[PDB]
Design a protein around this ligand. Structure first.
Ligand SMILES: *[C@@H]1O[C@H](CO)[C@@H](O)[C@H](O)[C@H]1NC(C)=O
Ligand SMILES: [Fe+3]
Ligand SMILES: [Fe+3]
Length: 310
């Protein structure tokens, strides 16, 4: 019957990176606040089961301890609209967070109900509600894997501080990807695999992480670190969602030529913009990704079919 209304079930989330305000009063920017507002509107119109932070949570040197007012001034008070208050955040660290006390950002999980950061790297598991279809997300700490970009003049992480700790995270990720039975597998980290902008591809991730994405049928890798919005897709059908425009916009196309031809499907970096983020919908059929500006405009939309997995 025409009047019978059945919704397509979907898991829905916002992916926002590099939103961490500024280290001087009032500890936030016009861009951070504009994005907090458009994120709230997006949750209230389209819905969201959670928010994923892609690192650089507090600029410029993270936090000192669990009592640092930055938690209040840059996070709690900014993302304060009532449509957001109970929506959980699942968080990982970026380079700027490792310049401070990262353990304090893990511990803050015990104080704020909505802040979830149980360890430097971890696995999340979700069902698409009202179905049997499941999604895994692996949250990586790319600083301990590759090094901190701020230690090098190139701003390219050239070596990890502790090689055995790096190797442990990579071995963990291999064991997990190999054993994952979920219908969709996503991996997230602060640093990019591919990006055409100011930092560009992270060589450590192109060498060590990229091979695993194809081997184990990962749908997408999500990241920030470059302060813009990009969508890329490789020959194996793996998507690269870059969303690091929660606070800054950088128009650099400096590494355009370091990315293989065909990969870039979308880039938005104009420095007039107030930034943006990405909204992801996962249904039984496909994963949809919409990039949304803080003005409210839809910039770009693409789909990733569900694939059978080994
Ligand atoms: C890091 O933060 C935790 C939680 O507040 C605190 O217990 C610890 O003393 C801090 N470490 C440093 C280096 O201050
Ligand atoms: Fe950043
Ligand atoms: Fe960064």
């Amino acid at each position: 019957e025409a009047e019978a209304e059945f919704a397509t079930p979907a898991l829905r989330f916002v992916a926002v990176g590099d939103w961490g305000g500024v280290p001087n009063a009032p500890f936030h920017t016009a861009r951070e606040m504009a994005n907090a507002k458009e994120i709230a509107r997006t949750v209230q119109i389209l819905g969201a089961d959670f928010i994923l932070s892609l690192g650089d949570n507090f600029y410029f040197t993270g936090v000192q301890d669990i009592n640092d007012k930055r938690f209040q001034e840059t996070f709690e008070d900014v993302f304060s609209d009532r449509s957001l208050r109970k929506v959980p955040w699942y968080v990982l660290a970026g380079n700027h967070d490792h310049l401070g006390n990262v353990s304090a950002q893990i511990a803050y999980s015990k104080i704020s109900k909505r802040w979830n950061f149980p360890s430097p790297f971890y696995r999340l598991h979700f069902k698409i509600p009202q179905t049997n279809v499941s999604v895994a997300i692996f949250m990586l700490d790319t600083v301990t894997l590759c090094g901190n970009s701020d230690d090098f003049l190139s701003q390219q992480p050239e070596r990890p501080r502790d090689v055995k700790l790096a190797r442990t995270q990579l071995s963990w990720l291999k064991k997990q990807l190999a054993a994952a039975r979920e219908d969709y597998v996503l991996v997230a980290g602060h640093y990019p695999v591919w990006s055409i902008a100011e930092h560009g591809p992270t060589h450590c991730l192109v060498k060590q992480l990229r091979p695993l994405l194809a081997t184990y049928g990962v749908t997408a890798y999500l990241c920030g670190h470059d302060h813009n919005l990009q969508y890329l897709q490789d020959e194996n059908g793996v998507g690269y969602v870059l969303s690091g425009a929660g606070n800054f916009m950088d128009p650099s196309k400096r590494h355009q030529r370091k990315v293989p031809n065909g990969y870039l499907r979308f880039h938005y970096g104009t420095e007039d913009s107030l930034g943006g983020f990405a909204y992801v919908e996962i249904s039984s059929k496909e994963m949809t990704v919409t990039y949304i500006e803080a003005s409210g405009k839809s910039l770009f939309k693409t789909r990733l079919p569900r694939r059978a997995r080994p």
